[PDB]
């Protein structure tokens, strides 16, 4: 048996894999995920990505959660930088455009994107920060164009010697190695409040069987054993918002 | 006026310690990615590390676990910590600042670490 | 770990000659590539940084360019003040390395 909410709203990742323009990685966008059903196969399953890192849950599991929201980031990057869109990782993209927790939960997805984002004369729409006084912290932004102060004298907006412009581009050229080509990241985030989860798989709801041993699935908390009514107050339904005592058997 | 002026070299016996620092004008060592780059004697150009403005650190893996980089705001001053030297650690030490990661546009007159008995 | 093989090790022209010096990387490195001068006792000097942009000061005379893994290194016509050793290096993938050098001495 499974209880999942009555939520039936597709959730918008199509908008969000699927965008024609993608933001620069410094600028990177964040798309908020609520109230809403997603089917998550589509994307594990996919041939389109190049990565499919997650951490802290298992890509095929995806389809039996709930959560109570979905970040999902994404933006542009050089190919051989996708690995540090990870946790734990240094360098000018992990500490100075997109940090990612220590405790991160969700998957990291990338695909090639040269055919889209690179042209002829190079695209020079797609930036990174180069400078940055301190690392950014874990999901924080920063878009500043302040000229990059990097002796004693002040700069007053005019850029020149120990005075730059903090963003540099990558320039995409479509005869450009893979590993300097443009690939294309969504960063998913995969939140647990204590609240009732409004993101869900498309998983269908059966009946609420009690007083008998079934294999349940009450929002992500899957075991054997027999659901029963309880007098306790603080497993809870979704659907009915009522109590159950779970006690083992096979 | 830019400068970079290291000290602290000299001959320092194997398995022993030393620390270089590298004095810097204009240029403001906390603001920069700054490296150090050795050349033992008669030969071409080693990296050996790099200090981020962020503080992120990296190292050659000839040195890894021996070096460590660091600075102090104050003084304007960079610093690389040596441990269990080695014969051929033997070099002179140029600190550098990268206008960005490993691009070396400013170079001091190095400092000499000779290592013997 | 990235091989930058530089050619030749030695070179030998007059006055005025036309110096070129090439570098192979062993993998892709773009445009990542820079060549630095260094005469005796001193201090490398950063000349051509990213294949082909010429550091403020430094004379017209030299110049860069490539991509990928083919690299050129030239002295249009060559100098007294030129007699250095001149190396180039790839500073976009960990670790950065160098080439051998060129040593460039001046026929007379």
């Known amino acids: 048996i499974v209880r999942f909410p009555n939520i039936t709203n597709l959730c918008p990742f199509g908008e969000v894999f699927n965008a024609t323009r993608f933001a620069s990685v410094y600028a990177w966008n964040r798309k908020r995920i609520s109230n809403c059903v997603a089917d998550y196969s589509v994307l594990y399953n996919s041939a389109s990505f190049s990565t499919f890192k997650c951490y802290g849950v298992s890509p095929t599991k995806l389809n039996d959660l709930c959560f109570t929201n979905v970040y999902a980031d994404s933006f542009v990057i050089r190919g051989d930088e996708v690995r540090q869109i990870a946790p734990g990782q240094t360098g000018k993209i992990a500490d100075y455009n997109y940090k990612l927790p220590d405790d991160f939960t969700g998957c990291v997805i990338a695909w090639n994107s040269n055919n889209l984002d690179s042209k002829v004369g190079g695209n020079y729409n797609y930036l990174y920060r180069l400078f940055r006084k301190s690392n950014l912290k874990p999901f924080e932004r920063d878009i500043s164009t302040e000229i990059y102060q990097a002796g004693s004298t002040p700069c007053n907006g005019v850029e020149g010697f120990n005075c730059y412009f903090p963003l540099q581009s990558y320039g995409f050229q479509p005869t450009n190695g893979v590993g300097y080509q443009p690939y294309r990241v969504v960063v998913l985030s995969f939140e647990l409040l204590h609240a009732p989860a409004t993101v869900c798989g498309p998983k269908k709801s059966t009946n609420l069987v009690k007083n008998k041993c079934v294999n349940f699935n009450f929002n992500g908390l899957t075991g054997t054993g027999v659901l029963t009514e309880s007098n306790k107050k603080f497993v809870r339904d979704p659907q009915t918002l009522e109590i159950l005592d779970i006690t083992p058997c096979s | 006026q830019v400068q970079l002026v290291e000290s602290g070299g000299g001959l320092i016996q194997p398995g022993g310690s030393l620390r270089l620092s590298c004095a810097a004008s204009?240029?403001?060592?906390?603001?920069?990615?700054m490296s150090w780059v050795r050349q033992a004697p008669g030969k071409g150009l080693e990296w050996v590390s790099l200090?981020?403005?962020?503080?992120?650190?990296y190292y050659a893996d000839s040195v890894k676990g021996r070096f460590t980089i660091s600075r102090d705001n104050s003084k304007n001053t960079l610093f690389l910590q040596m441990n269990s030297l080695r014969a051929e650690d033997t070099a002179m030490y140029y600190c550098?600042?990268?206008?960005?990661?490993?691009?070396?546009?400013?170079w001091g007159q190095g400092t000499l670490v000779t290592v013997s008995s | 770990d990235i091989v930058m093989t530089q050619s030749p090790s030695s070179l030998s022209a007059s006055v005025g000659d036309r110096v070129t010096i090439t570098c192979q990387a062993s993998?892709?490195?773009?445009?990542?590539c820079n060549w630095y001068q260094q005469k005796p006792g001193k201090a490398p000097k950063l000349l051509i940084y990213?294949?082909?942009n010429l550091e403020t000061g430094v004379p017209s005379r030299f110049s860069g360019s490539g991509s990928g893994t083919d690299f050129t290194f030239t002295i249009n016509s060559l100098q007294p003040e030129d007699i250095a050793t001149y190396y180039c290096?790839?500073?976009?993938?960990?670790?950065?390395?160098f080439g051998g050098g060129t040593k460039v001495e001046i026929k007379r």
């Open positions: 550098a600042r990268d206008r960005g990661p490993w691009l070396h546009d400013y």
């Open positions: 204009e240029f403001i060592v906390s603001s920069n990615y």
């Open positions: 200090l981020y403005s962020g503080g992120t650190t």
């Open positions: 993998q892709d490195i773009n445009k990542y």
């Open positions: 990213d294949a082909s």
């Open positions: 290096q790839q500073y976009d993938n960990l670790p950065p390395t």
